[PDB]
Symmetry: C6
Subunit: 66 residues, 6 copies
């Protein structure tokens, strides 16, 4: 309900994000795409990240909701 | 959900400052802006999406209204 | 939660102190103040909501009051 | 769980000591009091509640086959 | 449609296997049984291994 | 409605090597041979079964777009 709208926002308004994984590392780049389970983070090369492995997504600049 | 939702909503409404402890030991601070079955929107300097499954404990900076 | 509830509820009502171990090795301590399907509210110097999915084991400081059948 | 129940119930009926290893490395020990879809009740000096999702391996002190 | 034929091939051919857990622990033995949730590993005894705690399973040889 | 099937499928056909990062940090490099809903058959010295719920990110050594 919030997950997609959030993710969809970072993508549309193309804004860099610092994805912190459950393991304890911080990925970066832009949100190329996403579905129920995975998120395609397009940086140098689009790497697939599992949502179950994500701890928290952190945006650089704000983004509307509506 | 006769606890989690009421607990979170009261924090959200009253804007009670919370400390969210991640399973990986990381401590996040701020207040609850909103939430659903799967994520919580924490707001501090910015607004970050936190996955519930990665959350350990949520510690309010003060007692919550359950009545 | 066929077994979960009767277990947590007994600890709550009888006000029995417990130690909650998280999947990361952390040891919480206090009283079961409340619970539902996904979370447990532990009380101590403060009050906090603990997610069940982050819990490994709940160890009571002593067996609850047992009766006949 | 067509295996979990038979496996755990065998330990219960035979009163066989077991070692329960948590996903965090810690090992618990004692007897199997009871169990359902989500949890195992392990008895030692006291009866403690163990979530199955936090379990890696269940190891009996002896063969139950 | 993959893990079952994969696991059944290990029990039907009685091939030793290595089960690595998410915590970094390695388990050796033979696949005695497996269902939708657990994997019965056989050595000195038969232990019940939850799939949710299994990261990988590499065949011995 | 699907993102990981095509992502992994193309990485399979194009024979592109990958570096799989498990939730526990460690990394398993090799080629993707097959994959169902729950696991990914990783090829290398041997063919090992990798449970998806243990994967954090799938990082390809080469890119794949169109």
């Amino acid at each position: 309900l919030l997950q997609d709208p959030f993710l969809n926002a970072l993508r549309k308004e193309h804004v860099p994000v610092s994805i912190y994984l459950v393991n304890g590392i911080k990925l970066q780049g832009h949100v190329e795409s996403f579905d129920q389970y995975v998120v395609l983070l397009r940086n140098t090369v689009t790497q697939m990240v599992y949502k179950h492995a994500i701890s928290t997504v952190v945006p650089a600049r704000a983004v509307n909701l509506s």
